[PDB]
Amino acid sequence: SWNDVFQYETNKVTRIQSVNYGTIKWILHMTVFSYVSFALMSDKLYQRKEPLISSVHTKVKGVAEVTENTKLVHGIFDTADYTLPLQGNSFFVMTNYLKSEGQEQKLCPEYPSRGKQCHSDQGCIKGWMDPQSKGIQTGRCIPYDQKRKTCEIFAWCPAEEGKEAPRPALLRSAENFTVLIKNNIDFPGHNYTTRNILPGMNISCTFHKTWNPQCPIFRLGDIFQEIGENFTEVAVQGGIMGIEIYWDCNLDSWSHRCQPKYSFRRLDDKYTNESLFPGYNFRYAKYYKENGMEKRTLIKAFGVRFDILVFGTGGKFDIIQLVVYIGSTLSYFGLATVCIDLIINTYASTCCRSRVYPSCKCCEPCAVNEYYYRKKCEPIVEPKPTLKYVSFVDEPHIWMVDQQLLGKSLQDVKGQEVPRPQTDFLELSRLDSPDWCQCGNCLPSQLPENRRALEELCCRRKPGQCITTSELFSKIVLSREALQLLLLYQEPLLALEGEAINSKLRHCAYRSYATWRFVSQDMADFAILPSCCRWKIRKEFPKTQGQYSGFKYPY
Amino acid sequence: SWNDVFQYETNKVTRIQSVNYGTIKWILHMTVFSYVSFALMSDKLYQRKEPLISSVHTKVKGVAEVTENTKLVHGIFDTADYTLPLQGNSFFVMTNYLKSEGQEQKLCPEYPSRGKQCHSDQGCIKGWMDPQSKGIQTGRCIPYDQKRKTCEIFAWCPAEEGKEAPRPALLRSAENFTVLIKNNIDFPGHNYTTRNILPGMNISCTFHKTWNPQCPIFRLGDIFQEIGENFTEVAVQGGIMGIEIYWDCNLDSWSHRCQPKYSFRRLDDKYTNESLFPGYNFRYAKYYKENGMEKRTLIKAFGVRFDILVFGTGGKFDIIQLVVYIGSTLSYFGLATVCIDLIINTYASTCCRSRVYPSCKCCEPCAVNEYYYRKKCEPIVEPKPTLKYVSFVDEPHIWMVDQQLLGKSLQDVKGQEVPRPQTDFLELSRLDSPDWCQCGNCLPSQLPENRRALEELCCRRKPGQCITTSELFSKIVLSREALQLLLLYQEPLLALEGEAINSKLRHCAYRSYATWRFVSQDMADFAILPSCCRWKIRKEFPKTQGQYSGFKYPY
Amino acid sequence: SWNDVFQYETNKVTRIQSVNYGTIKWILHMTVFSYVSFALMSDKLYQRKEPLISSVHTKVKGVAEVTENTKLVHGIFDTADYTLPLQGNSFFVMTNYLKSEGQEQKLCPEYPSRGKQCHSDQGCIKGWMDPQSKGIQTGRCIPYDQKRKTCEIFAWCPAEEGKEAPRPALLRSAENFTVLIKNNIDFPGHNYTTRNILPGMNISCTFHKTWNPQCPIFRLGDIFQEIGENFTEVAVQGGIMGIEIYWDCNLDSWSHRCQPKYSFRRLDDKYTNESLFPGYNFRYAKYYKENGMEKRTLIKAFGVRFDILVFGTGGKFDIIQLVVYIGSTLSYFGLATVCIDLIINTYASTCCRSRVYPSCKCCEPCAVNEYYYRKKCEPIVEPKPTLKYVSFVDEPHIWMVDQQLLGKSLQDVKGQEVPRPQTDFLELSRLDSPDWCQCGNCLPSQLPENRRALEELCCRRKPGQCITTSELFSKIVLSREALQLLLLYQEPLLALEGEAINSKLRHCAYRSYATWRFVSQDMADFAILPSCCRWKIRKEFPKTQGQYSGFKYPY
């Protein structure tokens, strides 16, 4: 009970003083260790990594001049005139505009854009809502001008929807505008927070990839040129540009590095279909009361929407992550054992000696793997009731008959051949007949016919002299003195009298013959004695008034 | 030194030619492999997965008609009249509105909403700021109309806060409005970028779950109906609807699949308490100068705020992730070994033979596990100074006394029984008395009394003939020729003279008796000779002028 | 073929009935299990964790009074007067403002801010765009007032850019404003969704860290005070405050817990340089038509932008994650085996007996590890052609010469010493001369001179009596009867006639001598017989008309 808990099992091992195998094992161990360490260090798998939460504050600086008309109108544009109040992750800068002043909710012809003309009142629908014209049709075609006529619509009039964006863009000088971006990032799980601007930074700096990669002041034209985009062309219809701020932050004290990396990427497709609203624009309405009427000035503003995308992760050493990674990678250190054991098993096979070695003599010295295999593995078979081992004096090996005997004599059955183990030279360094019989000394079995084929076995497969004729048979098997000595060794105070001693001697003779002709006790316990030897043993130690049971299954 | 590095250790193994165990091992191996592969493939654990960074551009199309009043006013609503300039992840569409025109900062009665009436000036507070009424009270109750009176407040007047949203919603036609959503997603780590619109897409399409799941043009009424929401009812007070875009993107070349999946989800609670601002609405102010006074038109706009939620991950094959997963799952392949070893150990126990097997004869053939266990494990015990082994000729087994002898004779002590190993039949296949004594040949020990109980041992536990009477005792133990032969085998040129040869012969006799009666050298080295045999051996090889040391601890 | 699949290999093990080792093994197993379970439970490594998608709806309540001027103007501020229409993840509350009314696009002096004065027309540039002044210079210095003069610029006039924010802040009462935040979070992968407000919540509550941590109604002054921020001071120039909502949500049914945690964090740097736009402010333009001219009222609004940051993860039990973690941590259970095997190997070394044990007698009882090591490991060496084993009767050990013999006699070579294994006492418990010769019975080798040093070996290293003189040599080696008995044991029907029997007897004598003097068959197969014994054996069984081949490499 208590002693059961107080046990430790250690595997039995064979150590081989081999230069090749030791070198291979150490090389594989070092390779596995190097790869594991490189991965752990390269991927920071010892670090628990967290995503950041970001806040962005943008400030746009720049002044623009316009001289556009029917009178020549001079106009000044400041931040309040081309920027919306929003100053977060996205900010919009106007680069072009179409103005429709003094709009009133009434009837008017629709602008003739992209084949919008009509040639009859019936052609244009009545009550149809046209998002393109932004008005409700009255079913009449009215003259937009002298030459072309367009359908009447109830809408904000005059209606200029469909008018092409002015070219060149009016606010081209927006390329010279600057934007200051303040980014505050926090890793809430790591209890860390930082910002893209730190004390001691130059305030007159402008961002550059190489000279000033940390300056958070960006020129829009420089942003466009950094990625091969033409600000002048994009200004006509507008677009979307993304300013990516990447935070590859290491929060370990010994390797602390939390710096932003700035990049730019056009976010709107350059080749958008004309029907899918290419570019970026929106309509801005200014409502005012004139006299006693409500009027609207509509601005179709085209510009570049700057999306500030902030992403990244913060890594900090975690014991659990390192433990998990080490546990995952531990099993890879058995690669050396697996490979060397596979080599030993493969080179132990006889196939390589018969075929591979004669063809290639370089792989000859690896025949030593047979010795390693025989010192490493001990093959055994299932001890089932049908297991039987037979040895013939003429033949040098043993046969394993594990099949049921369905009347056919055991001699006739073939079985499968197995080798004879060496008989422990260390301990050995001391001083008419039945049809199936081929020795002339066998007799028919006295067992029931249903189980008689077991004892229908001869000492040899071909005619010749019986094994009993050898003097060793009498010395080992029939020598009463030797069997008595063995029994006394097992039972020092044994009583050498009665039929019990005869039965003990018969069993000892059976065991002696089995050990002599089969060597291993595993095979001896399942061996089958030949009829000649069995009956000679019984004739030396006859049973008075009983019937012989014969071989019995140990299990 | 150098040879120490050049070593390889391989485990000693026993292979069993068993159909059941091999089948179980292969079945378990295949099960583990199948589950591991299914997980790896199902969860793409070989892929490093990254979150996307998204940009959204929305374009709303639609025109609305209103005919509302005291004169009947006809009104046209376009995108600039019901959409805010923002066009990013969220866009708002107006569905209803309450208008208060020509507001001036002055005194006025507060709107009588939800029991806001007063019956006395003292009842209403003075200087109290009421966010519900949005004004500062003057402490007076003034007549809002003929029948009801409300407290005076300084505020934008006339004040209509508390007025119920018009029913039915004025801008019901907003259900017919359409929205085009352009989504650009990037996996910065995988250096990949894509968009929800690709060349060759239909431009007249409208989104449908089955017919057109990839059309990025959505009808708001269709959005509401897809999830069983009534646009007409929600339009009265407004709400929030989320358009989820999911990107389950695989970036492997052989399995490249990066497509958006569109879904809809109401984000505002349908059953919000009346005091928690049900629905979605906000107040929009238009300031204008009339004559020489600043006036404000307040619009309480109720509508649906459409939140475009973009989420997803991009997976790309990574060697490190696959290696980590394989290392994690490698240890699961030892399940077959664990289970089969457990079966062997459990079925080797004697308990099953005495109890389980007689009750159930189906589990009988599994008695072979005893052979496997005896061929697999070699039990040993700690060789401590108190370890002692005693054998009695009458008894068939050996006793292990590992307890200290506190004066009690070793014969009296019981110990614990252990079996006798087989005596290597292969090598064996050759040619008055003290109170505790039960054989009549033992003598009292000559050791100091403090350690005399060790030698107070007899050859048997019950009266009878001494083991010395057996001839094997003289042949093995007292045979001078045999001991000399053994010594010469160990020392070929040994000098057979002097008392040294006598001591060598005595030690050899002790060893011979221990091996004969204990077999295993592990037990023999810790065996204890009976007093009778010990003193007979000493009488055959007496020590001239010395005192016998007795048993000595090997370690 | 089929039987190859039907095999199972089980490791051979030695179990040790040791209290110390069993206790250590169980303690280490329990430690590993406890740590693994604690990690799994603490880190919820059995849970697949997902990030949330969030929607935020904000409602600000509050009314503010202002009495500011040249006439004293009384002003009322409501939500529409200090909040923008946006009500999502960020909302802005105005706390101070600078008003410039009736602006017109024309020429005017620039505001004299921070040394903006000029003393000459030439000093100021012409056509230079100044984002600070927000105007285009005309190259003239004009009198801003009686005492100071500033450069003329085309811009919105009058220009007040550079004017300091009023102190104290006009909208200080904003500290008393309240904000209601509704947060809807969804874990799309876990198919879960929840909100920060649930039925039964108090509607008159205000948020507090301890009393009401779940109230989603926050007072701005309370927000600032919770983290030691002064709302009154920040109101002058503005700032950014982040309201963090953390969702540590467990979606397991038995441990369901999805509740928000509210926190506050200032997001704008308190010590920003004066040139980097300290605080938070933006310019808001109101355009109106007066008479027939377009005029603009500019509001420089300073305030606090409240960024609502929502983050968190939802964890739900996943079988794959648990399986992966268990597989990763399984290999850690071999720590007990590794440590105990290391202890056994280290304490088996002889070094500790000679040096460590005499110095420290407490580590003496651990000498038992030698027995465990000898019962655990079986050292073997590579059987290479150069492997040779030599034994000298005078010496008690064996020498392994694995080096090539380059003419030097094998006797002269030293080799390396190795111990002699015990000769299986169980099986043993039965009945002039050449210059290099030191026994007088050796003879020169008859082999070719290129391979003659192999047989140039004597039975001893020093002069003395030859091993052949011992009677055991004749009994074991030269005894024809014993060799015949061995051969009959191997070949029962062997023919004892001809020269074949002589060769068999010579080989058996060689084997007998090798086994006697080397014991282990591994060393015996590579042993080298002394010239004296070799030639005595050959003289007993001479070869008639042949030349002796000598030692042959088994592999």
Ligand SMILES: Nc1nc2c(ncn2[C@@H]2O[C@H](COP(=O)(O)OP(=O)(O)O)[C@@H](O)[C@H]2O)c(=O)[nH]1
């Ligand atoms: N291996 C083996 N054992 C045998 C054989 N014959 C008998 N035995 C053993 O001897 C015992 C039966 O002895 P036997 O003289 O045949 O019958 P008994 O006189 O009734 O005891 C059984 O336990 C068998 O295991 C045989 O041919 N081979």
Ligand SMILES: Nc1nc2c(ncn2[C@@H]2O[C@H](COP(=O)(O)OP(=O)(O)O)[C@@H](O)[C@H]2O)c(=O)[nH]1
């Ligand atoms: N196993 C065992 N060994 C013994 C016993 N008695 C003596 N020995 C061994 O014999 C040696 C002592 O021999 P002994 O004749 O008793 O004393 P000595 O004459 O001084 O050598 C010691 O090394 C013991 O290990 C015994 O009862 N059992």
Ligand SMILES: Nc1nc2c(ncn2[C@@H]2O[C@H](COP(=O)(O)OP(=O)(O)O)[C@@H](O)[C@H]2O)c(=O)[nH]1
């Ligand atoms: N271990 C060992 N084996 C030897 C030695 N000499 C001969 N043999 C073995 O005996 C066989 C050769 O016998 P030998 O009488 O020398 O030559 P043969 O008469 O032609 O057979 C070879 O297979 C050797 O393995 C020796 O010194 N040591």
Ligand SMILES: CN1C(=O)CC[C@H]1C(=O)NCc1cccc(C(F)(F)F)c1Cl
């Ligand atoms: C064409 N303009 C004039 O003649 C006078 C100035 C200009 C105009 O009306 N500015 C209004 C305004 C204010 C903020 C943001 C925007 C945005 F849409 F660009 F983002 C806009 Cl348009």
Ligand SMILES: CN1C(=O)CC[C@H]1C(=O)NCc1cccc(C(F)(F)F)c1Cl
């Ligand atoms: C009631 N109305 C009229 O009589 C004339 C048109 C309409 C009105 O005033 N539009 C102002 C406006 C412009 C953009 C966005 C919005 C939003 F709040 F809905 F988002 C709004 Cl209200």
Ligand SMILES: CN1C(=O)CC[C@H]1C(=O)NCc1cccc(C(F)(F)F)c1Cl
């Ligand atoms: C100074 N004021 C007056 O004299 C009359 C009221 C006030 C004013 O003009 N409100 C305009 C307005 C409307 C919404 C949001 C904002 C924001 F910028 F603060 F966000 C603003 Cl400024």
Ligand SMILES: *[C@@H]1O[C@H](CO)[C@@H](O)[C@H](O)[C@H]1NC(C)=O
């Ligand atoms: C930007 O500024 C430079 C230098 O003042 C000027 O040469 C250039 O014309 C400007 N760009 C535009 C579009 O006006």
Ligand SMILES: *[C@@H]1O[C@H](CO)[C@@H](O)[C@H](O)[C@H]1NC(C)=O
């Ligand atoms: C950029 O676009 C403008 C107008 O579209 C054009 O005049 C100019 O040549 C373009 N520049 C480049 C480098 O393409």
Ligand SMILES: *[C@@H]1O[C@H](CO)[C@@H](O)[C@H](O)[C@H]1NC(C)=O
């Ligand atoms: C939407 O359009 C259809 C077809 O023109 C029309 O029948 C329906 O009344 C419209 N919905 C509303 C709310 O006007």
Ligand SMILES: *[C@@H]1O[C@H](CO)[C@@H](O)[C@H](O)[C@H]1NC(C)=O
């Ligand atoms: C939707 O709401 C409107 C007005 O609230 C109602 O008339 C109509 O019957 C509702 N439809 C459904 C399907 O509930």
Ligand SMILES: *[C@@H]1O[C@H](CO)[C@@H](O)[C@H](O)[C@H]1NC(C)=O
């Ligand atoms: C906030 O309200 C309290 C109580 O009404 C008042 O004492 C305090 O002065 C108010 N704060 C400001 C800045 O007016």
Ligand SMILES: *[C@@H]1O[C@H](CO)[C@@H](O)[C@H](O)[C@H]1NC(C)=O
């Ligand atoms: C907060 O700031 C105001 C004005 O800047 C000042 O009067 C007051 O003393 C400050 N309070 C604290 C606690 O610092």
Ligand code: NA
């Ligand atoms: Na493992």
Ligand SMILES: [Zn+2]
């Ligand atoms: Zn026969």
Ligand SMILES: [Zn+2]
């Ligand atoms: Zn025969």
Ligand SMILES: [Zn+2]
């Ligand atoms: Zn006795």
